[PDB]
Design a protein around this ligand. Structure first.
Ligand code: 55A
Lengths: 99, 99
């Protein structure tokens, strides 16, 4: 699809049989979801943004379907203000910016 | 232009006699610029992201040129690590997400 930006580009993602709303975030290097359970091993990681750094759990090679498009990649889980789809998965679904 | 997301979507912007590099950021509601001593009236604001909140100065009706596309609107100025072009100006230059 083509998504304009007068509203937040929120979309429905599917991850582990669960539907969630997430923000398509071109200013985010990585994908970070609010606290949830995911299966498998994780690694502690720290990521930073405008307000400083947080601790997250890094899960690798996780399937997520984003607005019907398949990605499999790294998903961080932690105290993000909102669920964020970052460039690591936006590239997988063929997302570009256009003007 | 079409901008892929393999790397950070940095572009050149001009605000007065400072050309700057800034992120085209679909996850940003507002435009947030690194500290600069802009003229005119402003209002204090707090904005939240990963890690918490920062204090910024809200300037209104500031002209900004983004890759030769003219925009004019609200610009927040504060201790952000990166210049961020948010949706308030992305809409003005006709920017969409496409996949
Ligand atoms: C709440 C939704 C988001 C968090 C709002 N922000 C925009 C976001 O794209 C930022 C941009 C960024 C990049 C590098 C360094 C710092 C920031 N990315 C990030 O914080 C990402 C996070 C990833 C690590 C997952 N950081 C990096 C290094 O990519 S935000 O920058 O915090 C932001 C921007 C505008 C705005 N207007 C009103 S509230 C508000 C919040």
């Amino acid at each position: 699809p083509q998504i304009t930006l007068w509203k937040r580009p929120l979309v429905t993602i599917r991850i582990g049989g669960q539907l969630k709303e997430a923000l398509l975030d071109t200013g985010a290097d990585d994908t970070v979801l609010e606290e949830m359970n995911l299966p498998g091993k994780w690694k502690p990681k720290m990521i930073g943004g405008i307000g400083g750094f947080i601790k997250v759990r890094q899960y690798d090679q996780i399937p997520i379907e984003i607005c019907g498009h398949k990605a499999i990649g790294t998903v961080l889980v932690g105290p993000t203000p909102v669920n964020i789809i970052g460039r690591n998965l936006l590239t997988q679904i063929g997302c570009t910016l256009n003007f």
